[PDB]
Scaffold this active site. Structure first.
Site, PDB file in Angstrom:
ATOM      1  N   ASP A 102      75.769 107.981   5.902  1.00 29.46           N
ATOM      2  CA  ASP A 102      76.546 109.069   5.315  1.00 29.46           C
ATOM      3  C   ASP A 102      75.667 109.953   4.437  1.00 29.46           C
ATOM      4  O   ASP A 102      75.705 111.187   4.533  1.00 29.46           O
ATOM      5  CB  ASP A 102      77.712 108.505   4.505  1.00 29.46           C
ATOM      6  N   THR A 130      85.765 111.972   7.168  1.00 26.01           N
ATOM      7  CA  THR A 130      86.638 111.413   8.196  1.00 26.01           C
ATOM      8  C   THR A 130      88.040 111.149   7.655  1.00 26.01           C
ATOM      9  O   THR A 130      89.042 111.571   8.251  1.00 26.01           O
ATOM     10  CB  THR A 130      86.028 110.125   8.740  1.00 26.01           C
ATOM     11  N   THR A 131      88.130 110.451   6.523  1.00 25.08           N
ATOM     12  CA  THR A 131      89.434 110.184   5.927  1.00 25.08           C
ATOM     13  C   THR A 131      90.130 111.482   5.549  1.00 25.08           C
ATOM     14  O   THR A 131      91.344 111.623   5.732  1.00 25.08           O
ATOM     15  CB  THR A 131      89.278 109.283   4.703  1.00 25.08           C
ATOM     16  N   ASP A 161      84.924 102.986   5.049  1.00 19.90           N
ATOM     17  CA  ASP A 161      84.697 104.209   5.805  1.00 19.90           C
ATOM     18  C   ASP A 161      85.857 104.435   6.765  1.00 19.90           C
ATOM     19  O   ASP A 161      86.299 103.507   7.448  1.00 19.90           O
ATOM     20  CB  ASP A 161      83.376 104.117   6.567  1.00 19.90           C
TER      21      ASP A 161
HETATM   22  N1  LIG Z   1      83.582 111.427  -9.001  1.00 24.00           N
HETATM   23  C1  LIG Z   1      84.576 112.029  -8.308  1.00 24.00           C
HETATM   24  N2  LIG Z   1      85.683 112.484  -8.930  1.00 24.00           N
HETATM   25  C2  LIG Z   1      86.676 113.085  -8.251  1.00 24.00           C
HETATM   26  N3  LIG Z   1      86.665 113.283  -6.924  1.00 24.00           N
HETATM   27  C3  LIG Z   1      85.615 112.878  -6.177  1.00 24.00           C
HETATM   28  C4  LIG Z   1      84.487 112.212  -6.841  1.00 24.00           C
HETATM   29  N4  LIG Z   1      83.596 111.917  -5.880  1.00 24.00           N
HETATM   30  C5  LIG Z   1      84.109 112.354  -4.702  1.00 24.00           C
HETATM   31  N5  LIG Z   1      85.314 112.925  -4.882  1.00 24.00           N
HETATM   32  C6  LIG Z   1      86.165 113.515  -3.824  1.00 24.00           C
HETATM   33  O1  LIG Z   1      86.458 112.526  -2.841  1.00 24.00           O
HETATM   34  C7  LIG Z   1      86.334 113.066  -1.527  1.00 24.00           C
HETATM   35  C8  LIG Z   1      85.486 112.126  -0.690  1.00 24.00           C
HETATM   36  O2  LIG Z   1      86.273 111.018  -0.272  1.00 24.00           O
HETATM   37  P1  LIG Z   1      85.627 109.948   0.733  1.00 24.00           P
HETATM   38  O3  LIG Z   1      86.096 108.564   0.358  1.00 24.00           O
HETATM   39  O4  LIG Z   1      84.156 110.265   0.844  1.00 24.00           O
HETATM   40  O5  LIG Z   1      86.336 110.399   2.103  1.00 24.00           O
HETATM   41  P2  LIG Z   1      85.458 110.687   3.417  1.00 24.00           P
HETATM   42  O6  LIG Z   1      84.703 109.399   3.626  1.00 24.00           O
HETATM   43  O7  LIG Z   1      86.481 110.994   4.481  1.00 24.00           O
HETATM   44  O8  LIG Z   1      84.600 111.866   3.029  1.00 24.00           O
HETATM   45  C9  LIG Z   1      85.670 114.425  -1.649  1.00 24.00           C
HETATM   46  O9  LIG Z   1      86.563 115.432  -1.167  1.00 24.00           O
HETATM   47  C10 LIG Z   1      85.421 114.637  -3.125  1.00 24.00           C
HETATM   48  O10 LIG Z   1      85.938 115.909  -3.519  1.00 24.00           O
END
Ligand SMILES: Nc1ncnc2c1ncn2[C@@H]1O[C@H](COP(=O)(O)OP(=O)(O)O)[C@@H](O)[C@H]1O
Ligand SMILES: Nc1ncnc2c1ncn2[C@@H]1O[C@H](COP(=O)(O)OP(=O)(O)O)[C@@H](O)[C@H]1O
Ligand SMILES: Nc1ncnc2c1ncn2[C@@H]1O[C@H](COP(=O)(O)OP(=O)(O)O)[C@@H](O)[C@H]1O
Ligand SMILES: [Mg+2]
Ligand SMILES: [Mg+2]
Ligand SMILES: [Mg+2]
Ligand SMILES: [Mg+2]
Ligand SMILES: [Mg+2]
Lengths: 528, 532, 232, 98, 526
Positions: free
Chosen positions: E389, E91-92, E58
């Site tokens: 989350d 957040t990221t 996270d």
């Molecule tokens: N199965 C998937 N394939 C492609 N992109 C994805 C998938 N699942 C989530 N994402 C993308 O990854 C991002 C989420 O990244 P994440 O690690 O949750 O960062 P944060 O914790 O800051 O939200 C979202 O913008 C989403 O569009």
């Protein structure tokens, strides 16, 4: 910033960039100018500087004061450098260069502060300096009559003006007469080494004298010297570079004998060599014998027996001056001592001056050298008298080279400021402010004169500006009468080249200082 | 010879030192002037960070040693206290006045003449501003207030969002307007509660048509929304009754201990019942409330908020019509509470703002109040928005109180410089020079404005001065008084037409304070610094 | 007023002009003049008690502990360990007077101290020091002219040495040899006259050998028309 | 261009706007900057002018190379593109003689 | 004698150096967690100064466990915390976006553009970004549980809990749905106070469940009390059930023989009266936040009542919400409505070597507990973070039923829309506008980089695809590194999360761009 695990420059590198560093440079130049500010004018004051060893230097000379100051600021060193330049090329005005450069920088500091491009200021300074130099050359008064009396009067007035700011200003006319007389007897190159400066403690300034010949201190007499006569009425002087001693023939020489007869012969041969040299010197007809190399006690007694005078270990420059005065030639060998290589003076005498013995060679009719004998109550007193006389001598030499004079007391600079303001009032306008600032900065010298004299600078400056505007070129500060006067009629004269060089050096220094935008200082290596 | 245990500086040395200190203070904040100014980022040597453009905050946070630099710092503080705007300009003007006065003194002009010239120049500048450079707000309307707020919020973190923030500021100020005796409309700024909470963008900042409390209900069992609120404001804690130092309980008959202990809480129970019998729905108290009274309020389905700030409680009571009750005691010696001491509001809620909660007293009756909730991305920007918003509120208050405004963007300084340069020729000989240097010093504001935008400061200021000279010479071109600076394009512009306005009080007070500071520092010619 | 200047720039950046400027002192303007006048006054007031026949002696101790009881002002100031530069100027003035004349090395210091003491109260009334120096020069010229006017001539014949004897006695009257005063004056006059270039020329002090040996009495001091050697 | 006062480790002043002199009097410690300085000095030795051009061009090339590496290109591809473009520039340059 | 103007410890930097340093610090903040974005993100180990280990991916946790000195980095950390608190996700994404915008702003700052122009361009771009996001959104039928579960899954595909997706989705959805409350016309969710997460190390993660009630780590006060009650009537209290001193000083004076015994007997009688008042309601379970005296325990057991003492106030409030009761401080004022009817089972059972109290059969409970069984403490902490989350995403969707395509589709669509808009600006601020518009490509670029595919080819193909008309839902498949339509892959994000991320990143860039001078070292002067 960021730590940047591996850094670009070595640690400790200090860098300053932008407007603040230029403002700091201008402030440093102001600080340097302040340290010599009160030394300018007939009402100027001396500065005393003590070094680490405990020796004190007292001087009214701007270049000397700046040199004794150990300046480390990169921008401030430029003022010291231009002071040295003015001293080297001219010899006078070493305070005016620093004051003018600092005033230029101070005047353009505000315009720098709004972010004006430095190149514009540099161009404005260059144009203003060119115009000022041309105006100085145009309006400088020169006399194309080649009158010897008028030339002597001009030289004396210039020397008096150059001398009326030092501690010997009370005897300025008398010292100026000495300086002019001394300079006029140099032949064609006006070499400084041909004018002797001897400082003898004791006596008043009026006791100082100029010797139409050469004089030097007695040099370590040997036994039997006191039996030699100390006055001759038509001596012939033998200038030698010879060691009249009983010594080894050569460093690598070595004598091998196997008979006592040869031993005695060798001893008598050494004695005969020495006596042959002495006999040649005696039969040359000379009565006064001077040598650069030591003269032994045997030779001293030999010359005493013949009613002759001997003086060994004479300094090389003193021997050269004796050559130029008496008119002989220094001989490394005595095998040919003809009348051509023998000096001649009317009177030679040894006298006592303030607890010291001096030898005098007077009466030389065709002398090309001089000797100043300075009297004072302290060694710093005589040193500063020598510095003032050096300033006067340099001024007189420059006047001999070209007798183009301008009135002093700031009159020339007030005229230049008026001319530059008139020029600046007829240009587009971005350069007009900078040229007007240059003209205003040209007013520093009369204002500093008034401040040093205890005047009211504003009223005197207003009167000078009005007089110059309404007509009048040589009106400057009258220090004695608390007013202004026509300084040309007051015989306050300076060579034009003095102001030309001062303006050129000050403008160059200001342009160089302004042109710098970044200062980088590498960390010190081998701090020890 | 003097034998004073300290360091003594006399003459031009101390004067130059004071001028250098003032110049350093001015140079610190000179880069935060005007719309093209930029904020600073202060660190409190422990990790605390402050991002601000306000001159007063910057000078307060800094630790300063030199007395003259201090003098400038409290000068900025006083300017902020009495006006609220122009804090950087007054410091800059004072430092430039000191610089030029020191120049005159170094030119052997006596400091008394410089002081007299500065006094005359300040008086004449104030007179000229009042007589030629003021614009009445009567013929402008709400647009004048909007433009003044936008100009104040220029050079601040809320500059681009001015179209929204000026409306919010004007509405908030007009909401708290009240008329006192003598028929003077007064605008009590600092009665608008400012709440900072990071989260949504700046455009989501809310203007509460009521009041906002930075506190929540004391018990989770109480309702968090009441429609027809009957607010009861109290100034005493609702806890178990304890007797004072002069009262002591001594038991000889053991049968009375239970009665004593029961009555200790029954007293507060009766007080709560008396308060609640009048239909009160919201109860606010500056003191604490313990669990028993909290449960009493829970059973009745009424609000109960403890540790309410005294100023917040006073504002809520004044807006809603409630009266603060430090105690329950009438003039008959009894202990009663009637409905007359109840304030009214048409909604009281507890909203959630970025994982936290606060109480909103919406639409109080009998008087309109206001509050602002500032939303940012972190605490630093919220604090900076609070400072800028306070500056805008102060500017709007000044404009609404005194109905005179002046053109901004260096127009006033240029006109003053031209007029004073012309006028100096009719006063004395050296005081003439002092007035001329005052006029020249007044030109630093447009110079700094132009410099901060990387514009040609010299040419722009020359054009401004030419425009103002033409205005003051030709008697039919008087409309050029409003020609100020347009920093977006680096050209002169009619600022009155462009809507760049400042209150006249800002300029007047800044001039007076800067002149007095320059006079005070200029009076010194010697310093004795005793060893501690 | 001291230590020089300390600004460190108006932008906070370092402002270094002169090497080791933090540990260097400086005096500016009138206070420097007052300090110099006070130091010279101290030196002159120390010297003035050894002026005249009733003047007392100063007992000088050097760095090695050697003791020199003396009345000669030049010797006292030469053996005085001073640090003030104006005091060094006073010492050099005494040495200059000794070298040029040989007598009056104590009067010069007192005169200079009095001149600077008067210049102090002249400066306090707002007169430029250069003007004070010019007035002093004018008054000195007047005094020198008056001295030339009121001067009197004496005969320097060897047949009649009475004026020379009286002058030598006046010179010696302030010294410890005033017990043998007349004999000392007689031997000094005879020593100078015996070795001197008669035509008003120089007197070579290299031909006057002064030798001293402990024992005996001061009255045993004698002039020997020859050479005394420390051999046998 | 503006002159720079550079003071080396021996307290020797150098006021100049010559890039080669400035780099010579600077105590450069980063080895990549050392390569750049060596290239500038080689340019000074071979021709005598253009050192500041060498610095500016190398800096711009490396900045844009960093950009290209960030957007996804490999180092070898950037290098080969730079070499091809340098060859093309050298081919073009004679045609620009006036 | 250091005269000085400012204190000797005060240091001032200004000019281009300050801006470059701030932007580089923001870039470094971005680079710390650049690799922790996407379904193929790798986890990081954080060593706390207290000796603990935080193993997570996270963004907010990683940034929170990091101490920095450059105040721009502190600003970025505050941005991370704000994004976590406001919406709970992205957040990221917001950190990376802020870094990229500050980089593209540094590009212009190197030239002769004033920062105010860049800030104005950024604000105009942010307005257009918000407009485009609102334009490309789609509605959601909240009554469709399948859609909600899919949204939660898409939220949690990037976390370590993705191995058990259906279980976590069901837990989060049920907890959020049954913590939802509505009173006095006010709607609330309140995940923070209620919906507690209780983690017990051991067992298996598949055994995790959300109880229809509350569970606490407490045991019966006396062993004779029942540990299993079918349909308990629960009564909650705050006040202690023991004799206590009064508020005022109440010294007694005994002179008779029988007064001491009388005092003690009246203490016992007071306890008896309190217990009788409690018993009058005929309850089965009594819960108290404070101590219960032993004599009180005897009197309660005499009436067959189970008592639990020393419970946290938050736990008591959660029990009150779960079992439909309200806490009463004075037993003599115990009304019938205060008695908690609705709990369907109360059971004290031992898990491991510790007793736990379960109230886990409530009908219509407004509070709940999430019982997590796992390998260790760190694994359970990460699972709790993932559940937080998911629950935040669920509550955001419930508050705002709008969704936006994920997997980089939204960023590319908004970038294309802003680029097309910029073609008519014809000004000097169009360049920063377009730069900050195309800076949104860092999200698909980071997804591709973490996936391991070719960045330049995939981004070029995605841009070419987005240049078409109906291609706003085309993004990057984070697993296979291929261009897929997100209405086929099914990855969606709440509109609130995207809006908050974009707003916060743009405002971070604006705030850091506004600064050009740093002064530090001065005292607090508090
Ligand atoms: N199965 C998937 N394939 C492609 N992109 C994805 C998938 N699942 C989530 N994402 C993308 O990854 C991002 C989420 O990244 P994440 O690690 O949750 O960062 P944060 O914790 O800051 O939200 C979202 O913008 C989403 O569009
Ligand atoms: N008699 C005088 N009256 C007025 N000014 C004079 C007089 N003599 C010299 N000056 C001024 O003094 C200035 C130079 O001062 P001085 O100390 O002699 O030389 P320097 O410039 O080398 O310090 C000149 O500008 C000259 O105008
Ligand atoms: N839109 C604008 N155009 C030109 N000048 C402006 C504008 N807005 C403000 N100014 C000027 O910028 C100056 C600086 O104001 P500012 O520094 O923000 O206030 P303070 O001095 O209280 O911090 C003001 O004197 C004002 O006249
Ligand atoms: Mg001179
Ligand atoms: Mg303002
Ligand atoms: Mg005597
Ligand atoms: Mg070149
Ligand atoms: Mg996420």
């Amino acid at each position: 910033m960021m730590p940047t695990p591996v850094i670009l420059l070595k640690e400790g590198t200090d860098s300053s960039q932008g407007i603040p560093q230029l403002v700091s440079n201008i402030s440093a130049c102001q600080v340097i100018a302040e340290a010599v500010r009160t030394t300018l004018g007939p009402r100027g004051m001396d500065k005393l500087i003590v070094d680490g060893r405990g020796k004190a230097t007292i001087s009214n000379d701007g270049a000397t004061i700046l040199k004794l100051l150990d300046v480390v600021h990169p921008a401030a060193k430029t003022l010291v450098d231009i002071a040295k330049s003015q001293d080297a090329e001219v010899g006078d005005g070493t305070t005016s260069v620093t004051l003018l450069a600092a005033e230029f920088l101070k005047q353009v500091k505000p315009y720098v502060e709004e972010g004006l491009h430095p190149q514009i200021i540099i161009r404005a300074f260059r144009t203003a300096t060119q115009l000022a130099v041309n105006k100085i050359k145009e309006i400088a008064v020169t006399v194309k009559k080649a009158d010897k009396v008028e030339q002597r009067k001009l030289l004396e007035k210039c020397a008096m003006t150059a001398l009326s700011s030092k501690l010997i200003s009370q005897q300025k006319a008398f010292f100026a007469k000495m300086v002019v007389d001394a300079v006029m007897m140099l032949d064609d190159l006006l070499q400084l080494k041909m004018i002797g400066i001897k400082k003898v403690q004791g006596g008043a300034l009026e006791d100082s004298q100029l010797v139409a010949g050469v004089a030097f201190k007695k040099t370590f007499s040997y036994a039997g010297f006191e039996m030699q006569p100390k006055k001759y009425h038509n001596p012939k002087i033998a200038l030698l570079n010879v060691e009249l001693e009983l010594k080894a023939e050569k460093d690598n020489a070595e004598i091998r004998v196997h008979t006592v007869e040869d031993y005695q012969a060798i001893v008598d041969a050494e004695w005969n060599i020495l006596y042959d040299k002495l006999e040649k010197i005696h039969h040359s007809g000379a009565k006064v014998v001077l040598s650069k190399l030591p003269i032994g006690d045997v030779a001293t007694q030999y010359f005493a027996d013949r009613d002759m005078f001997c003086a060994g270990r004479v300094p090389e420059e003193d021997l050269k001056r004796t050559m130029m005065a008496c008119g002989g030639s220094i001989q490394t060998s005595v095998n040919a001592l003809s009348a051509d290589v023998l000096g001649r003076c009317q009177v030679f005498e040894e006298t006592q001056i303030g607890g010291e013995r001096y030898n005098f060679f007077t009466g030389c009719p065709k002398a090309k050298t001089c000797t100043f004998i300075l009297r004072g109550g302290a060694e710093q007193f005589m040193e500063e008298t020598e510095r003032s006389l050096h300033d006067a001598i340099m001024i007189v030499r420059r006047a001999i080279k070209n007798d183009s004079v301008v009135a002093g007391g700031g009159a020339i600079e007030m005229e230049l400021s008026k001319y530059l303001r008139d020029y600046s009032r007829t240009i587009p306008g971005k350069q007009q402010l900078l040229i007007g600032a240059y003209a205003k900065a040209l007013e520093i010298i009369p204002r500093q004169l008034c401040d040093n004299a205890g005047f009211d600078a504003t009223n005197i400056l207003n009167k000078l500006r009005a007089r110059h505007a309404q007509g009048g070129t040589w009106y400057g500060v009258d220090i004695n009468n608390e007013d202004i006067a026509d300084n040309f009629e007051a015989f306050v004269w300076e060579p034009a080249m003095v102001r030309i060089n001062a303006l050129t050096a000050a403008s160059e220094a200001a342009c160089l200082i302004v042109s710098v935008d970044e200062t980088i200082k590498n960390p010190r290596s081998t701090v020890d | 010879p003097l034998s004073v245990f300290g360091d003594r500086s006399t003459g031009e040395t101390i004067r130059s030192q004071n001028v250098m200190a003032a110049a350093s203070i001015a140079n610190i904040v000179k880069s935060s002037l005007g719309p093209v100014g930029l904020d600073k980022m202060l660190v409190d040597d422990i990790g605390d960070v402050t991002i601000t453009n306000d001159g007063a905050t910057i000078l307060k946070l800094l630790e300063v040693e030199h007395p003259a630099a201090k003098v400038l710092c409290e000068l900025a503080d006083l300017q902020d206290k009495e006006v609220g705007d122009g804090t950087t300009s007054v410091v800059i003007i004072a430092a430039e006045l000191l610089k030029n006065a020191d120049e005159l003194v170094k030119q052997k002009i006596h400091p008394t003449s410089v002081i007299s010239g500065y006094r005359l120049a300040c008086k004449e500048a104030v007179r000229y501003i009042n007589e030629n450079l003021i614009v009445n707000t009567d013929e402008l309307g709400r647009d004048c207030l909007i433009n003044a707020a936008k100009t104040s919020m220029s050079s601040k973190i809320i500059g681009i969002n001015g179209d929204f923030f000026a409306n919010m500021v004007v509405d908030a100020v007009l909401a708290i307007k009240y008329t006192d005796i003598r028929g003077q409309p007064r605008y009590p700024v600092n009665s608008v509660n400012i709440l900072k909470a990071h989260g949504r963008s700046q455009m989501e900042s809310m203007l509460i048509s009521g009041y906002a409390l930075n506190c929540v209900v004391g018990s989770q069992g109480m309702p968090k929304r009441i429609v027809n609120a009957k607010i009861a404001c109290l100034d005493f804690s609702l806890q178990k009754t304890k007797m004072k130092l002069g009262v002591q309980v001594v038991i000889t008959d053991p049968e009375k201990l239970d009665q004593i202990r029961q009555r200790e809480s029954d007293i507060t129970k009766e007080r709560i019942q008396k308060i609640l019998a009048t239909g009160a729905n919201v109860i606010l108290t500056t003191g604490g409330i313990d669990d028993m009274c909290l449960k009493y309020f829970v059973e009745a389905g009424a609000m109960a908020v403890r540790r309410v700030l005294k100023r917040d409680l006073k504002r809520i009571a004044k807006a809603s019509g409630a009266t603060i009750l430090s105690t329950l005691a009438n003039l008959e010696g009894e202990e009663t509470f009637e409905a007359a001491m109840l304030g009214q509001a048409e909604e009281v809620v507890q909203e959630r703002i970025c994982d936290d909660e606060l109480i909103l007293i919406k639409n109080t009756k009998a008087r309109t109040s206001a509050s602002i909730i500032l939303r940012g991305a972190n605490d630093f920007m919220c604090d900076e928005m609070e400072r800028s918003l306070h500056d805008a509120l102060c500017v709007v208050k000044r404009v609404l109180e005194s109905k005179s405004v002046v053109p901004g963007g260096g127009a006033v300084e240029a006109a003053l410089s031209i007029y004073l340069e012309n006028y100096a020729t009719s006063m004395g000989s050296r005081e003439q020079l002092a007035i001329a240097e005052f006029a020249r010093s007044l030109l630093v504001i447009p110079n700094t404005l132009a410099v901060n935008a990387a514009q040609d400061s010299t040419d722009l200021v020359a054009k401004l001065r030419a425009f103002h000279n033409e205005a003051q010479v030709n008697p039919e071109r008087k409309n050029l008084k409003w020609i100020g600076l347009d920093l977006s394009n680096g050209k002169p512009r009619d600022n009155k037409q462009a809507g760049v306005f400042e209150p006249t009080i800002v300029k007047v007070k800044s001039l007076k304070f800067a002149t007095e500071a320059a006079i005070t520092i200029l009076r010194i010619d010697d310093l004795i610094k005793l060893h501690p | 007023a001291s230590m020089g200047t300390l600004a460190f720039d108006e932008y906070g950046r370092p402002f270094l002009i002169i090497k080791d400027q933090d540990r260097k002192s400086r005096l500016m303007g009138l206070e420097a003049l007052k300090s110099h006048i006070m130091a010279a006054k101290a030196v002159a007031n120390t010297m003035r008690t050894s002026l005249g026949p009733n003047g007392l002696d100063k007992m000088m101790v050097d760095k090695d502990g050697d003791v020199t009881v003396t009345n000669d002002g030049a010797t006292i100031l030469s053996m005085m360990d001073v640090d003030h530069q104006i005091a060094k100027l006073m010492v050099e003035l005494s040495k200059s007077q000794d070298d040029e004349i040989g007598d009056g090395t104590t009067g010069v210091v007192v005169l200079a101290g009095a001149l600077l003491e008067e210049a102090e109260q002249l400066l306090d009334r707002g007169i430029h020091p250069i003007r004070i120096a010019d007035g002093y020069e004018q008054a000195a010229r007047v005094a020198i002219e008056h001295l030339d006017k009121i001067s009197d001539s004496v005969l320097v014949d060897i047949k009649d040495t009475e004026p020379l004897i009286q002058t030598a006695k006046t010179t010696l009257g302030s010294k410890v040899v005033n017990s043998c005063h007349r004999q000392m004056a007689e031997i000094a006059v005879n020593a100078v006259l015996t070795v001197a270039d008669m035509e008003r020329r120089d007197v070579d002090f290299e031909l006057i050998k002064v030798e001293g040996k402990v024992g005996g009495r001061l009255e045993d001091t004698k002039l020997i028309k020859g050479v005394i050697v420390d051999k046998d | 261009g503006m002159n720079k006062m550079v003071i080396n480790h021996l307290e020797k002043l150098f006021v100049t706007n010559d890039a080669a002199t400035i780099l010579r009097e600077l105590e450069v410690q980063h080895p990549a900057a050392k390569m750049i300085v060596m290239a500038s000095h080689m340019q000074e030795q071979e021709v005598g002018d253009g050192t500041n051009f060498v610095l500016v061009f190398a800096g711009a090339l490396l900045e844009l190379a960093e950009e290209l590496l960030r957007i996804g290109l490999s180092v070898s591809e950037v290098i080969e593109g730079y070499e091809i473009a340098c060859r093309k520039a050298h081919e073009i340059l004679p045609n620009l003689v006036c | 004698r250091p005269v000085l103007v400012l204190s000797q410890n005060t240091k001032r930097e200004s000019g281009r150096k300050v801006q470059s340093g701030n932007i580089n610090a923001a870039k470094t903040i971005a680079d710390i967690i650049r690799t922790c974005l996407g379904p193929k993100s790798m986890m990081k180990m954080l060593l706390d100064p207290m000796g603990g280990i935080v193993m997570t991916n996270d963004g907010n946790a990683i940034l929170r466990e990091i101490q920095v000195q450059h105040p721009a980095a502190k600003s970025m950390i505050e941005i991370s915390r704000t994004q976590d608190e406001e919406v709970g996700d992205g957040t990221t994404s917001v950190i990376i976006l802020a870094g990229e915008m500050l980089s593209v702003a540094e590009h212009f700052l190197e030239q002769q553009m004033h920062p105010t122009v860049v800030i104005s361009a950024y604000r105009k771009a942010l307005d257009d970004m918000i407009s485009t996001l609102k334009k490309i959104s789609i509605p959601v039928d909240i009554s469709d549980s399948d859609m909600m579960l899919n949204i939660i899954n898409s939220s949690i595909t990037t976390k370590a809990i993705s191995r058990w997706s259906s279980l976590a989705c069901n837990i989060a959805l049920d907890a959020v749905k049954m913590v939802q409350f509505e009173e006095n016309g006010r709607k609330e969710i309140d995940i923070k106070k209620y919906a507690r997460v209780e983690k017990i190390p051991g067992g298996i993660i598949e055994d995790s469940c959300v109880l229809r009630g509350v569970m606490i780590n407490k045991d019966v006060t006396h062993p004779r009390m029942r540990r299993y009650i079918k349909n308990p009537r629960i009564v909650l209290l705050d006040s202690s059930l023991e004799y206590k001193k009064g508020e005022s000083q109440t010294d007694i004076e005994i002179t008779r023989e029988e007064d001491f015994t009388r005092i003690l007997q009246m203490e016992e009688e007071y306890i008896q009266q309190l217990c009788e008042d409690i018993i009058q309601l005929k309850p089965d379970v009594v819960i108290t936040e404070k101590g219960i005296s032993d004599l009180a325990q005897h009197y309660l057991m005499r009436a067959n009542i189970t008592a639990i003492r020393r419970v946290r106030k938050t736990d008591n409030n959660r029990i009150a919400r779960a079992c439909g009761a309200r806490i009463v401080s004075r037993p003599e004022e115990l009304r019938e409505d205060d008695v908690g009817t609705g709990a369907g089972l109360l059971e004290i059972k031992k898990i491991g070597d510790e007793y736990f109290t379960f109230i886990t059969d409530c009908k219509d409970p407004k509070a709940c507990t999430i019982l997590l069984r796992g390998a260790s403490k760190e694994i359970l902490s990460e699972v709790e973070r993932n559940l937080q989350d998911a629950m935040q995403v669920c509550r955001n969707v419930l508050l705002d039923p709008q969704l936006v395509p994920g997997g980089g589709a939204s960023e590319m669509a908004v970038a294309h829309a802003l680029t097309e808009k910029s073609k008519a600006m014809t000004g000097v601020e169009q360049w920063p506008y377009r730069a900050v518009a195309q800076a949104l490509e860092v999200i698909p670029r980071t997804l591709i980089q973490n996936c391991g595919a070719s960045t330049i080819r995939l981004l070029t193909s995605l841009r070419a695809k987005h240049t078409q008309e109906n291609c706003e839902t085309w993004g990057v498949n984070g697993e296979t590194g291929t261009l897929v339509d997100m209405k086929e892959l099914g990855i969606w994000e709440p509109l609130a999360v995207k809006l908050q991320t974009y707003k916060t990143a743009v405002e971070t860039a604006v705030l850091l761009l506004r600064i050009d001078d740093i002064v530090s070292g001065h005292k607090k002067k508090g």
